[PDB]
């Protein structure tokens, strides 16, 4: 193994991270190789000790200091360089503050030496050549003070700070350690998500397109979520009513059943910048009014709103559901368990979002219109009864694009069949 | 342009300034190259290696190496600091080419092979390649593919299925016919590509080291030797996608990607259709990450037979495992490459290891 | 299906009417008036300045908003500048209802007294101090548009014309309760008798031109071509006829509206809002005493509930409820 600290600023140096004897046996060699070719340089020239790859960064007037990062590649290097740049900037600021303090001390010493030389000259004025060494020392101190002032001015033109820099360098390494092999993957995923959420559209032509399709639409955590979705009788109609848009409230006596409902909240699609403001878990409240005058996610204590009690659970249409519920429930009934179900659900959600986007585009670009829309839905986007959640997500994204986010609800006229047993 | 000057490290006694500049015969300033070579060779301690020197003071990214036999040697490539974001995506190919040209002549008994001018001759090719490598209106393409759906759409689906297979897992295509580089750019800036698919396809065609497109102006023949191409780098995720009229590629199959092409053809517009392909790439990367996580949470214990059971059980949760899972397996094998770790590597690469 | 749920106030609300389909102003015990929009659904303007009971607004014939509070005065507002323009305070008690006559210049605040006013010159012509009982509604004859409003003492109707004619035929068989009266397709009068003898009137002789299974009635408007007309009884809907005199609820009925294209709708106190036709859909989700409805030719229905909030419905056919959730709570 290797320690991702690289505390070596002397090489003749600071306990940061070390667990192998080779760590502080190749760190000195790396520091010496970095200081041999000495300014602001950064080089990573090989490594040793069973492939302990590292990366160095960095009598006389200055002190050669550097910071290493041993990690047993180019993407991670470019990722850590962004943080090491700020780390080196803070270190240079601290060094400039220390140099200013040393220059002030040297100026005070030079003033004291000049006063002593003046006193010696005044004492010797009452009696040949004397106080020559004192005058030479005063001149040398004045020259050193002038050089220090010039260096400080050049540094300005071109303690607490050290502790802050150390804490920053120690907290920035945690991300690189946790993403030693997924840093670039997460970066590209975030970039793609941003570039997909930013679309900004074209001109008044698309403005009128959106207005027309909106007018036409009007005149018509992970571990607990996997454990709950696995051991649950008749979970397919419950998740169908949850995803189709029907409010799925929970009813229980204790607080554990109400807290477990927050774990399964990674499947419900939001509608605005927030997710669910009226969320009163394990609290008796008149949810009869909030089920129609608030968001679609709320809980109420026991002692189109499908109620999920401690013994039974309602449903929107348990007679025939779509192929999405089995596709989402087969993961819980398989070996996939642990930090995988959340990513699978997110992938299925973005796939459904793209499907609803294509559905809207095809429905607006291709009684005759309803027939073509149903034909498109049956050809792709639905199999048996999944033509409702697709339209729900389509309407949601259409309202989100039109900068109109909810109190526009919708009633689905379907038999409840709240037995589910 | 990016290759300023190359050098050869001769560290027999102390140091040797064997510099071989580009566009000029030799063994920005004249002595600066020798000074940088001496600075890079001064840190060469006594025990095929690799190194890097991003010298921001003088502005020279000297990517030097360390070669061994009788004494210490090495190859150095001086490049200005203005191409920092340019040399990083091309470093994986440059280092491989340097290791390949340095391995020929690295033995213990006698490995001279007249290493006087052949090394400079081999480095000149890489210098010219790097100098040439430096420096698509789908509104009608999708419409034509939807109208015809016999030649263009079929060829696009075949190319995507070939690039979503193990034969062309990482941008496998060299040249087909003519000089129309529109299809190359289309395959680059879309799915079934890599740099975030922005710095993969470039110049320096005619069987380069590694890239995404080599669409040279081949109007007479392939401009390459088939046995030489099959003996040089055939054991690699690359294929010869012949898109002249209709021809599939291989490495001497329909999948779920056909639905994506069908949706692209049946979706009108194409003026701002980049969001759909972006979402497709996003869900593909999410599925690849899910697969690699499901593999890692089972191979972390280091048990070898546990990987086989995990791969067998993953077929139930995979949609159309086999033919359609080829792209997922290729992504899960190319993500880490770009006892537990050796077992995972052997599982992710079973037919790509016969390169001995 | 559902279109939009709107939050109007935090207290009770009586009704909401307006001449346009893109605007509707509520009225409750808060004494404040606020309008909305059918297609968007937000507060466009706001009118405040009173805290008494406001139950007097129908229509002006630009477009304004008027209402009479319970503090013996009436306030007038505007629909474009939300500012007070006049103020009339001369009455001695509450005001029951207010109406307007078309093609004329008069507005009548019918209740506890009979008077005459004007929308522009607002001068007092003549007023007889009698009929201290609150007036239910107000109608007018088709030939002269004479004010016909009576109190609550017995079955009697007398026309009063204070516009041009003199004080003649001024106010004051079975004992019952009358709550409302409106016009009819055959251009005559119609009343409501809950005793068990449904009677009507005419325009040339009004001699009553003349039944069992009858609690009280509130409103009666289910006619569009003079072929079918009845009232809203406390048990259900009893369809009747005028040319022939021949022929699922748990509470009374507050209002009955005749929707276009031959659609009949009603309300109840338990939220039972069902849509029927001339020969016989239904919704669910409300458990409060919903008030009268308001249908629009461009958007869905706008109902009024008594649970401190309202909701904008829609005409849905071919038929998970708040009532069931409250019952199973």
Swiss-Prot record, chain A:
The keyword Phosphoprotein applies. PROSITE patterns: DENN_FLCN_SMCR8 (PS51834). It is found in: Cytoplasm; Nucleus; Presynapse; Postsynapse. One of its GO terms (cellular component) is chromatin. Component of the C9orf72-SMCR8 complex, a complex that has guanine nucleotide exchange factor (GEF) activity and regulates autophagy. In the complex, C9orf72 and SMCR8 probably constitute the catalytic subunits that promote the exchange of GDP to GTP, converting inactive GDP-bound RAB8A and RAB39B into their active GTP-bound form, thereby promoting autophagosome maturation. The C9orf72-SMCR8 complex also acts as a negative regulator of autophagy initiation by interacting with the ULK1/ATG1 kinase complex and inhibiting its protein kinase activity. The gene is SMCR8. Transmembrane segments: none annotated. It comes from Homo sapiens. This is Guanine nucleotide exchange protein SMCR8. Component of the C9orf72-SMCR8 complex, at least composed of C9orf72, SMCR8 and WDR41. The complex is formed of two protomers, each individually consisting of one molecule each of C9orf72, SMCR8 and WDR41. The protomers homodimerize via an interaction between C9orf72 (via C-terminus) and SMCR8 (via N-terminus). Within each protomer SMCR8 (via DENN domain) acts as a bridging protein between WDR41 (via C-terminus and N-terminus) and C9orf72 (via C-terminus). The C9orf72-SMCR8 complex associates with the ULK1/ATG1 kinase complex. Interacts with C9orf72; the interaction is direct. Signal peptide: none annotated. Pfam families: Folliculin. Residues 360-402 are annotated as: Interacts with WDR41 within the C9orf72-SMCR8 complex. Keywords: Autophagy, Cell projection, Cytoplasm, Guanine-nucleotide releasing factor, Nucleus, Phosphoprotein, Synapse, Transcription, Transcription regulation. Residues 1-127 form the uDENN FLCN/SMCR8-type domain. Phosphorylation by TBK1 is required to promote autophagosome maturation. Phosphorylated by ULK1. The keyword Translocase does not apply. InterPro entries: FLCN/SMCR8_DENN (IPR037521), Folliculin/SMCR8_longin (IPR037520). Expressed in all tissues tested. Residues 342-398 form the dDENN FLCN/SMCR8-type domain.
UniProtKB/Swiss-Prot annotation, chain B:
Residues 253-339 form the dDENN C9ORF72-type domain. GO terms for cellular component: autophagosome; axonal growth cone; cytoplasm; cytoplasmic stress granule; cytosol; dendrite; endosome; extracellular space. Residues 1-135 form the uDENN C9ORF72-type domain. The keyword RNA-binding does not apply. InterPro entries: C9orf72. The keyword rRNA-binding does not apply. Residues 140-252 form the cDENN C9ORF72-type domain. One of its GO terms (biological process) is negative regulation of protein phosphorylation. One of its GO terms (molecular function) is guanyl-nucleotide exchange factor activity. It is found in: Cytoplasm; Nucleus; Cytoplasm, P-body; Cytoplasm, Stress granule. Both isoforms are widely expressed, including kidney, lung, liver, heart, testis and several brain regions, such as cerebellum. Also expressed in the frontal cortex and in lymphoblasts (at protein level). Acts as a guanine-nucleotide releasing factor (GEF) for Rab GTPases by promoting the conversion of inactive RAB-GDP to the active form RAB-GTP. Acts as a GEF for RAB39A which enables HOPS-mediated autophagosome-lysosome membrane tethering and fusion in mammalian autophagy. Component of the C9orf72-SMCR8 complex where both subunits display GEF activity and that regulates autophagy. As part of the C9orf72-SMCR8-WDR41 (CSW) complex, functions as GEF for RAB8A and RAB39B, thereby promoting autophagosome maturation. Component of the C9orf72-SMCR8 complex, at least composed of C9orf72, SMCR8 and WDR41. The complex is formed of two protomers, each individually consisting of one molecule each of C9orf72, SMCR8 and WDR41. The protomers homodimerize via an interaction between C9orf72 (via C-terminus) and SMCR8 (via N-terminus). Within each protomer SMCR8 (via DENN domain) acts as a bridging protein between WDR41 (via C-terminus and N-terminus) and C9orf72 (via C-terminus). The C9orf72-SMCR8 complex associates with the ULK1/ATG1 kinase complex. This is Guanine nucleotide exchange factor C9orf72. It comes from Homo sapiens (Human).
Curated annotation (Swiss-Prot), chain C:
Keywords: Autophagy, Cytoplasm, Repeat, WD repeat. Gene3D superfamilies: YVTN repeat-like/Quinoprotein amine dehydrogenase. Changing residue 323 to R: No effect on interaction with SMCR8. GO terms for biological process: autophagy; negative regulation of exocytosis; negative regulation of immune response; regulation of autophagy. It holds the Pfam family Beta-prop_WDR41. The keyword S-adenosyl-L-methionine does not apply. WD repeats lie at residues 7-46, 49-87, 90-127, 173-210, 248-280, 285-319. PROSITE patterns: WD_REPEATS_1, WD_REPEATS_2, WD_REPEATS_REGION. Its main location: cytoplasm. It is found in: Cytoplasm. SUPFAM superfamilies: WD40 repeat-like. It comes from the Eukaryota. GO terms for cellular component: cytoplasm; guanyl-nucleotide exchange factor complex; lysosomal membrane. GO terms for molecular function: GTPase activator activity. Non-catalytic component of the C9orf72-SMCR8 complex, a complex that has guanine nucleotide exchange factor (GEF) activity and regulates autophagy. The C9orf72-SMCR8 complex promotes the exchange of GDP to GTP, converting inactive GDP-bound RAB8A and RAB39B into their active GTP-bound form, thereby promoting autophagosome maturation. As part of the C9orf72-SMCR8 complex, stimulates RAB8A and RAB11A GTPase activity in vitro, however WDR42 is shown not be an essential complex component for this function. PANTHER family: WD REPEAT-CONTAINING PROTEIN 41, WDR41-RELATED. Component of the C9orf72-SMCR8 complex, at least composed of C9orf72, SMCR8 and WDR41. The complex is formed of two protomers, each individually consisting of one molecule each of C9orf72, SMCR8 and WDR41. The protomers homodimerize via an interaction between C9orf72 (via C-terminus) and SMCR8 (via N-terminus). Within each protomer SMCR8 (via DENN domain) acts as a bridging protein between WDR41 (via C-terminus and N-terminus) and C9orf72 (via C-terminus). The C9orf72-SMCR8 complex associates with the ULK1/ATG1 kinase complex. This is WD repeat-containing protein 41. The gene is WDR41.
């Amino acid at each position: 193994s290797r320690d991702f600290i690289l505390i070596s600023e002397f090489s003749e140096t600071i306990p940061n991270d070390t667990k192998v004897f080779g760590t502080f046996d190749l760190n000195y060699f790396s520091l010496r190789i970095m200081s041999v070719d000495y300014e602001d340089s950064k080089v990573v020239l090989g490594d040793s000790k069973e492939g302990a790859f590292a990366y160095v960064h960095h009598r006389g007037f200055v002190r050669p200091f550097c910071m290493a990062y041993i990690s047993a590649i180019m993407q991670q290097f470019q990722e850590l360089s962004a943080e090491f740049s700020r780390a080196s900037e803070c270190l240079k600021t601290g060094n400039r503050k220390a140099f200013a303090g040393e220059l002030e001390k040297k100026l005070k010493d030079l003033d004291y030496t000049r006063t002593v030389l003046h006193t010696e000259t005044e004492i010797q004025k009452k009696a040949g050549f004397y106080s020559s060494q004192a005058i030479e020392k005063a001149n040398e101190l004045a020259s050193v003070e002038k050089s220090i002032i010039e260096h400080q001015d050049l540094l300005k033109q071109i303690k607490t700070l050290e502790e802050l820099c150390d804490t920053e360098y120690f907290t920035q390494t945690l991300a690189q350690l946790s993403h030693i092999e997924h840093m670039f993957r997460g970066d590209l995923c975030y970039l793609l998500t941003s570039q997909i959420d930013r679309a900004k559209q074209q001109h008044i032509t698309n403005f009128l397109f959106e207005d027309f399709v909106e007018v036409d639409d009007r005149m018509v955590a992970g571990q607990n979520a996997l454990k709950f979705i696995r051991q649950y009788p008749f979970a397919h109609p419950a998740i169908y009513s949850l995803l189709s848009g029907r409010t799925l409230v929970v009813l229980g006596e204790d607080e554990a059943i109400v807290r477990k409902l927050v774990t399964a909240l990674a499947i419900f699609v939001p509608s605005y910048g927030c997710y669910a403001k009226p969320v009163k878990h394990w609290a008796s409240s008149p949810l009869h009014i909030m089920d129609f005058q608030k968001w679609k996610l709320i809980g109420l204590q026991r002692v189109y709103t499908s109620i999920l009690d401690l013994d039974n659970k309602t449903l929107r249409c348990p007679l025939y559901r779509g192929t999405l519920v089995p596709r989402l429930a087969d993961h819980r009934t398989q070996i996939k368990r642990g930090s995988t179900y959340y990513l699978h659900v997110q992938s299925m959600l973005t796939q459904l979002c793209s499907k609803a986007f294509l559905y809207t585009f095809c429905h607006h670009l291709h009684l005759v219109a309803s027939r073509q829309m149903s034909f498109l839905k049956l050809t792709l986007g639905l199999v048996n009864e999944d033509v409702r959640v697709v339209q729900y997500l389509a309407e949601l994204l259409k309202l989100h694009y039109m900068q109109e986010s909810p109190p526009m609800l919708r009633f689905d006229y379907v038999p409840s069949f709240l037995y589910k047993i | 342009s990016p290759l300023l000057a190359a050098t050869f490290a001769y560290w027999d006694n102390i140091l040797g300034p064997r510099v071989r500049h580009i566009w000029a015969p030799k063994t920005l300033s004249d002595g600066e190259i020798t000074f940088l070579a001496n600075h890079t060779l001064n840190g060469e301690i006594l025990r095929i290696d690799v190194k890097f020197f991003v010298l921001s003071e003088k502005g020279v990214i000297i990517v030097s190496l360390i070669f061994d036999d009788r004494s210490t040697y090495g190859l150095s490539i001086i490049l200005p600091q203005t191409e920092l974001s340019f040399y990083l995506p091309l470093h994986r190919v440059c280092v491989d080419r340097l290791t390949h040209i340095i391995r020929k002549g690295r033995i213990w008994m006698h490995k001279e092979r007249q290493e006087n001018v052949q090394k400079i001759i081999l480095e000149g090719t890489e210098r010219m390649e790097d100098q040439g490598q430096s420096i698509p209106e789908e509104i009608d393409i999708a419409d034509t593919v939807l109208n015809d759906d016999d030649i263009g759409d079929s060829c696009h689906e075949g190319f995507l299925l070939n690039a979503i297979s193990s034969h062309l897992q990482t941008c496998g295509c060299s040249v087909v016919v003519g000089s129309s580089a529109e299809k190359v750019n289309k395959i680059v800036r879309t799915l079934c590509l890599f740099c975030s698919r922005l710095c993969e396809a470039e110049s320096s065609f005619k069987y380069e080291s590694g890239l995404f497109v080599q669409g040279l102006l081949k109007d007479s023949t392939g401009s390459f030797v088939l046995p030489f191409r099959q003996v040089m780098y055939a054991p690699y995720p690359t294929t010869h996608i012949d898109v002249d009229v209709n021809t599939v590629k291989q490495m001497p199959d329909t999948l779920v990607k056909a639905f994506l092409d069908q949706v692209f053809q049946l979706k009108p517009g194409l003026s701002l259709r980049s969001t759909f392909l972006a979402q497709f790439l996003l869900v593909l990367h999410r599925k690849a990450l899910t697969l690699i996580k499901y593999i890692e949470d089972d191979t972390q214990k280091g048990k070898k037979p546990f990987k086989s059971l995990r791969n067998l059980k993953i077929d139930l949760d995979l949609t159309a495992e086999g033919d359609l899972n080829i792209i997922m397996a290729l992504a899960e094998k190319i993500k880490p490459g770009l006892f537990g770790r050796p077992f995972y590597t052997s599982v992710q690469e079973r037919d790509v290891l016969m390169t001995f | 299906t559902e279109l939009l749920v709107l939050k109007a106030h935090h207290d009770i609300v009586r009704f909401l009417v307006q001449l346009d389909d893109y605007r509707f102003a509520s009225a409750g015990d808060d004494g404040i008036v606020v309008v909305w929009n059918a297609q968007t659904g937000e507060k466009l303007l706001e009118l405040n300045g009173h805290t008494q009971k406001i139950t007097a607004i129908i229509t002006f014939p630009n477009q304004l908003i008027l209402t009479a509070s319970a503090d013996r005065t009436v306030i007038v507002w505007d629909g474009d500048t939300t500012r007070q323009v006049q103020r009339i305070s001369c009455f001695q008690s509450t005001v029951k209802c207010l109406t307007v006559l078309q093609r004329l210049d008069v507005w009548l605040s019918g209740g506890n007294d009979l008077c005459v006013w004007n929308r522009k010159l607002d001068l007092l012509c003549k007023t007889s101090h009698l009929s201290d009982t609150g007036i239910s509604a107000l109608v007018e004859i088709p030939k002269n548009c004479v004010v016909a409003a009576v109190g609550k003492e017995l079955i009697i109707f007398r026309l009063v014309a204070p516009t041009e004619g003199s004080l003649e035929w001024d106010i004051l068989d079975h004992q019952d309760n009358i709550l409302s009266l409106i016009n009819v397709n055959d251009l005559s009068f119609v009343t409501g008798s809950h005793v068990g003898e449904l009677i009507i009137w005419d325009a040339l002789d009004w001699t009553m031109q003349a039944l069992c299974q009858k609690n009280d009635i509130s409103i009666h408007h289910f006619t569009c071509d003079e072929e079918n007309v009845f009232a809203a009884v406390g048990r259900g809907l009893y369809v009747y006829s005028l040319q022939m005199k021949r022929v699922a609820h748990d509470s009374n009925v507050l209002h009955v509206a005749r929707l276009p294209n031959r659609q009949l709708i009603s309300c109840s106190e338990d939220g039972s809002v069902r849509i029927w036709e001339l020969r016989e859909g239904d919704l669910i989700g409300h458990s409060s005493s919903v008030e009268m409805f308001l249908y629009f030719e461009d958007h869905g229905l706008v109902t009024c509930s008594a649970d401190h909030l309202i909701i904008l419905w829609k005409n849905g056919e071919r038929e998970l409820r708040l009532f069931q959730k409250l019952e199973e709570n």
